[PDB]
Design a protein around this ligand. Sequence first.
Ligand SMILES: [Ca+2]
Ligand SMILES: [Ca+2]
Length: 123
Amino acid sequence: KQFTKCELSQLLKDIDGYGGIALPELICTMFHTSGYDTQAIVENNESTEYGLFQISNKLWCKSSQVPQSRNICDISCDKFLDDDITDDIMCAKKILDIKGIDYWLAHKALCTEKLEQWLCEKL
Ligand SMILES: [Ca+2]
Ligand SMILES: [Ca+2]
């Protein structure tokens, strides 16, 4: 499941304003982060990041790769690879609450201006 800009927008609509974050800027961040793909898996040394919001097994979810993980979202990382983003949103709201929008590098780099394009058209 790879969403289009409008699909995701409607799904995340209730969340505009959460953490002081504007929906378009979150839309832009996700675009450069996973391309709105619920199956994105990105790996490196000490870790792997999962799904839509690219949540890290290093601190946020539990995976056999990093057994010492604090597992802040009390959930295994496979739950971020399925079609239901409900739980991904709950963990992401946790990240926003604790760390802030800066968890995602793409926000400060490409999502603080030219936001008009990240707005949904009409279906
Ligand atoms: Ca999920
Ligand atoms: Ca999926």
